[PDB]
């Protein structure tokens, strides 16, 4: 395959001191674990467990994430990314790092986020709230991309919103990575329904624009009230579901452009499909969420060619957000 490079924030990391991105060399500053009282486990992932907790020194509600004793490399990567992004718009705030006595591993403490006030993005929102919260997610993505970081796991479960106060956080930076031009990355990132075509066709030289495809998948599910929008039964069927919408000729042009050697299974299952107009997904019960601006925006995110997709900053300038107070 031919190389690719991000068209924005291309060499951010190249120009930084090595300490910025060389997470393996990072030295952890430890707090005191007994400042935190675990209240209940909220969830369990492949690499962590998350808990509702209280900082008993000040009665503050916090979220604690105990990192499973997997590859230490991944632990330092998440910590370094969270410290580099700390204070950025809508980025979850890492307040402390303590050693859990039971797991014997680092436990990350997050402040200004709690399970009572903030909830995962599982709500059915109005047109205005979709635009408002999508703009808040874009502020987080433009910030992390501008800091040379790709999130690689954008999905509803990684967006926390306090609806009463209209606050949002982009969470779970466990799959995030530093972008370096020319670097090959693992394609086993993101949840199936949110995987970009680059991951499905095994193109490793991807970049920040992967997060923009995932965002487009979220948007399409919200405006069309179809969860998930691209509902593949496995990774092979996931690309067929995308191709039934966007067509196979632009997919094959994308594969041709980057000289991707396609898995032969895809040539057997893809067949030939033409692009559908978005109005094919509009019906009486979602038409109130659809506008010409929403369709144009969706169209500019959901493009096979990762270099052609809107970037997070270009998305912030799009007409879909003109109505959002900024």
Q: Which of 66, 92, 112 is the last residue of a domain?
A: 112
Is there a single domain that holds both residue 142 and residue 9? yes
Candidates 194, 234, 233, 230; CA nearest to 214 is: 194
241 and 254 belong to one structural domain:
yes
Question: What is the torsional sign of CA 126, 230, 308, 177?
Answer: positive
Same-domain check for residues 157 and 304: yes
Tell me: do 101 and 239 sit in the same domain.
no
Contacts 24+ apart (CB under 8 A), 82-85: 82/108, 82/173, 84/20, 84/147, 84/149, 85/143, 85/144, 85/147, 85/149, 85/173
43 annotated as a binding-site residue: yes
Of 214, 200, 203, 176, nearest to 309 by C-alpha is 214
In a shared domain, residues 186 and 300: yes
Three-state secondary structure call for residue 120: strand
Integer Cα distance of 292 and 294 in angstroms: 6
Residue 46 assigned as binding residue? yes
Provide the CATH number for the domain around residue 244. Answer: 1.10.510.10
Resolution (A): 1.2
Q: Check whether residue 40 and residue 81 sit in a common domain.
A: yes
Q: Which residue spans within 29-172 are E strands per DSSP?
A: 36-44, 48-55, 60-67, 93-99, 106-111, 119-120, 149-150, 159-162, 167-170
Residues 36 and 12 in one domain: no
Domain end call among 91, 112, 133: 112
Final residue before a domain boundary, out of 112, 128, 146 = 112
Domain count, the chain: 2
Closest among 94, 77, 96, 55 to 152, alpha carbons compared: 77
**Is 146 assigned a ligand-binding role in the annotation?**
no
Phi-psi region of 206 (alpha: psi -120 to 50; beta: other; left: phi over 0): beta
Q: Which domain holds residue 45?
A: 22-112
Backbone angles phi, psi at 287, to 5 degrees: -60, -25
94, 238: one domain:
no
Rg over CA atoms, the chain: 20
- Residues designated as active site: 153
Cβ–Cβ < 8 Å for 1, 261: yes
Closest CA relative to residue 180, chosen from 5, 2, 1, 3: 5
First to last CA, the chain: 41
**150 and 106 within one domain:** no
Residue 47 assigned ligand-binding role:
yes
10 Å CB burial of residue 197 (0-12, 13-18, 19+) is: buried
Residues 57 and 196 in one domain: no
Q: What is the DSSP letter of 274?
A: P
**CATH number of the CATH domain containing 82:** 3.30.200.20
Q: Are 177 and 77 in contact (CB under 8 A)?
A: yes
Q: How was this structure determined?
A: X-ray
**String of DSSP letters for 237-273:** HHHHHHHHHH-HHHHHHHHHHTT----HHHHHH----
Using DSSP, state whether 16 is helix, strand or coil.
Answer: coil
| Residue whose entry in the numeric block shows the structure tokens 């499909």 | 273
Instruction: Return the ∠ at Cα 190 (arms to 187 and 195), rounded to 5°.
Output: 75
Strand, coil or helix: 30: coil
Report residue 143 as tokens: 């910030």
Residues 68, 43 share a domain: yes
17 and 69 in a common domain: no
Is 68 annotated in a binding site? The answer is no
Annotated ligand binding at 45? The verdict is yes
Annotated binding residue 36: no
């Amino acid at each position: 395959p031919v190389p690719s490079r991000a068209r924005v924030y291309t060499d951010v990391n190249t120009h930084r001191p090595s300490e910025y991105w060389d997470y393996e060399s990072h030295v952890v500053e430890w707090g005191n674990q007994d400042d935190y009282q675990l209240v209940r486990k909220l969830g369990r992932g492949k690499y962590s467990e998350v808990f509702e907790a209280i900082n008993i020194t000040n009665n503050e509600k916090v979220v604690v994430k105990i990192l499973k004793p997997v590859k230490k490399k991944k632990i330092k990567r998440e910590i370094k990314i969270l410290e580099n992004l700390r204070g950025g718009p809508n980025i979850i705030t890492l307040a402390d790092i303590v050693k859990d006595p039971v797991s014997r591993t680092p436990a990350l403490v997050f402040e200004h986020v709690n399970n009572t006030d903030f909830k995962q993005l599982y709500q059915t929102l109005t047109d205005y709230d979709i635009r408002f919260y999508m703009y808040e997610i874009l502020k987080a993505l433009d910030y992390c991309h501008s800091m040379g970081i790709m999130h690689r796991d954008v999905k509803p479960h990684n967006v926390m919103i306090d609806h009463e106060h209209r606050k949002l956080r982009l969470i779970d930076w466990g799959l995030a990575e530093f972008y370096h031009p020319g670097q090959e990355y693992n394609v086993r990132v993101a949840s199936r329904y949110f995987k970009g075509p680059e991951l499905l066709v095994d193109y490793q030289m991807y970049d920040y624009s992967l997060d923009m495809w995932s965002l487009g998948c979220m948007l399409a599910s919200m405006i069309f009230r179809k969860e998930p929008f691209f509902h593949g039964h496995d990774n092979y069927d996931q690309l067929v579901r995308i191709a039934k919408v966007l067509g196979t000729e632009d997919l094959y042009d994308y594969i041709d452009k980057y000289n991707i050697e396609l898995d032969p299974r895809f040539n057997d299952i893809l067949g030939r499909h033409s692009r559908k107009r978005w109005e094919r997904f509009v019906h009486s019960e979602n038409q109130h969420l659809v506008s010409p601006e929403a369709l144009d925006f969706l169209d500019k995110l959901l493009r096979y060619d990762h270099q052609s997709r809107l970037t997070a900053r270009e998305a912030m300038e799009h007409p879909y957000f003109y109505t959002v107070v900024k």
